[PDB]
């Protein structure tokens, strides 16, 4: 049950920063009330995603060292992580602890919302898989944290400067792995795995986009820019 002071600080700071913003009540219950419609569901889901993107961009702005990085690189990392992050969040939301409320319902909206059942089946498989890992808020926070902090992102001019900030997070997730799940482990390798995994999922994602349609509705200008089009 190790965990140095420098680490617990970081984890405490990150876990603080992780649960601050949160999804606005309005957009949230919007899935509980209001009803179905392949076009409505698309609007709801497409609204949220636009929100999540705002939240995320705040979290990454208050992640140790972040504002210290070259301005361009900062974009890059955000442009770079936006989807994957959402995947993790998506993961976190779905599997694990059913608060017996809206979430199980969120899946219905996704199911039949102009999204081909050929993409929601493998995707919802992946999520079930990370679910097998039985993670904790901390892991999700760190995973998201380390993912936003990837030096191997298509355009960042200075990778060393990004790593410095990434390693610490990485070292905290690792030692955090032994502790919560020592039975194996490999669990820390497995996780870094899913990271490499969702990276190819960002690939199926841009494709499935150009085929998602729904009447003729459009994507919020933000998504159009962070989901390319």
């Amino acid at each position: 049950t190790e965990l140095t002071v420098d680490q617990q600080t970081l984890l405490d700071y990150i876990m603080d920063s992780y649960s601050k913003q949160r999804m606005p009540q309005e957009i949230t219950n919007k899935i509980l009330k209001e009803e179905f419609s392949a076009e409505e569901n698309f609007l709801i889901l497409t609204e949220m995603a636009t929100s999540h993107v705002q939240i995320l961009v705040e979290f990454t702005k208050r992640l140790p060292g972040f504002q210290t990085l070259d301005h361009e690189d900062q974009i890059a990392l955000l442009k770079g992580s936006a989807v994957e992050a959402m995947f993790l969040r998506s993961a976190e939301i779905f599997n694990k602890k059913l608060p017996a409320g809206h979430a199980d319902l969120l899946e219905e909206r996704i199911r039949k919302s102009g999204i081909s059942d050929e993409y929601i089946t493998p995707m919802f498989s992946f999520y079930k898989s990370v679910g097998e890992l039985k993670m904790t808020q901390e892991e999700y926070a760190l995973l998201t944290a380390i993912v936003i902090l990837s030096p191997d992102r298509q355009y960042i001019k200075d990778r060393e400067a990004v790593e410095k900030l990434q390693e610490p997070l990485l070292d905290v997730l690792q030692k955090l792995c032994k502790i919560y799940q020592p039975e194996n482990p490999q669990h820390f390798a497995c996780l870094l795995g899913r990271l490499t995994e969702l990276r190819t999922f960002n690939h199926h994602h841009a494709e499935m986009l150009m085929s998602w349609r729904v009447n003729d509705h459009k994507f919020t200008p933000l998504l159009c820019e962070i989901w390319d089009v």
């Binding site: 974009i75 955000l78 442009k79 200008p221």
Partner: peptide, 12 residues
Amino acid sequence: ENALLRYLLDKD
């Protein structure tokens, strides 16, 4: 040009 994101980066 990622103008929307930039705007969200600097004071959201």
